[PDB]
Design a protein around this ligand. Structure first.
Ligand SMILES: COc1ccc2nc(C)c(O[C@@H]3C[C@H]4C(=O)N[C@]5(C(=O)NS(=O)(=O)C6(C)CC6)C[C@H]5/C=C\CCCCC[C@H](NC(=O)OC5(C)CC5)C(=O)N4C3)nc2c1
Ligand SMILES: [Zn+2]
Length: 198
């Protein structure tokens, strides 16, 4: 009934992939209880750092990546949800179900990756476990893993970046192509598709 209608909570930043130094590692910045509370209020007073955030809703967890001042992620994770911020929920500034893409203004304190213009096909996928996985680009939106592995290892990493050797953003991880549960290839939203939507 109209009286009891609920609203979906915000996407919440719950951690980050630290790429500051020589060793990549995940950091949690908010636990599940505080995540649920922040999703309901949409008010997140935590300091944000870095390029790759770990994000969560009430039911899903995935990644979000800042490129050119926009925090980008997948529509299949975030839907049309707002993101929590220090002054309340923030509405998406980009939404494209056809590309499986959404974006919000990048949070204060984040660092943005630069869009790649190298034209290189030797890529690196960053997962939610801070694994850096070499990927050979195979098309506009596809790459093959140099070392295949079960899809379990990639689950929860949509919204993460594919980077070039120079650390530029080449695309946003969207889907994993597997055979008998082994991921052989990935699909991603190319950064040019991001740059066009901007
Ligand atoms: C609803 O509106 C939509 C609009 C556009 C759209 N466009 C898609 C391509 C899309 O594809 C969905 C979600 C993707 C996923 O699972 N994305 C990862 C991930 O990690 N998600 S996640 O866990 O973070 C999670 C669920 C958010 C919390 C990166 C995958 C890691 C493991 C694969 C597991 C088996 C799943 C393997 C599967 N292959 C696959 O479709 O291959 C093809 C044929 C090349 C496509 C896959 O990858 N997807 C299935 N859905 C939408 C939904
Ligand atoms: Zn580059």
């Amino acid at each position: 009934h109209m009286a009891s209608m609920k609203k979906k909570g915000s996407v919440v930043i719950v951690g980050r992939i630290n790429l500051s130094g020589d060793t990549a590692y995940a950091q949690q910045t908010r636990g599940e209880e505080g995540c649920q509370e922040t999703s309901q209020t949409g008010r997140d007073k935590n300091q944000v750092e870095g390029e790759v955030q770990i994000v969560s809703t009430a039911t899903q967890t995935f990644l979000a990546t800042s490129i050119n001042g926009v925090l980008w992620t997948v529509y299949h994770g975030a839907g049309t949800r707002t993101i929590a911020s220090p002054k309340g929920p923030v509405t998406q500034m980009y939404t494209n179900v056809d590309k499986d893409l959404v974006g919000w203004q990048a949070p204060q304190g984040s660092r943005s990756l630069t869009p790649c213009t190298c034209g290189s096909s030797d890529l690196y996928l960053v997962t939610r476990h801070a694994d850096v996985i070499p990927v050979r680009r195979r098309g506009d939106s596809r790459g093959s893993l140099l070392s295949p592995r079960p899809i379990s290892y990639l689950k929860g990493s949509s919204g993460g970046p594919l980077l070039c050797p120079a650390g530029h953003a080449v695309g946003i991880f969207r889907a994993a192509v597997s055979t008998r549960g082994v991921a052989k290839a990935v699909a991603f939203i190319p950064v040019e598709s991001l740059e066009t939507t901007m």
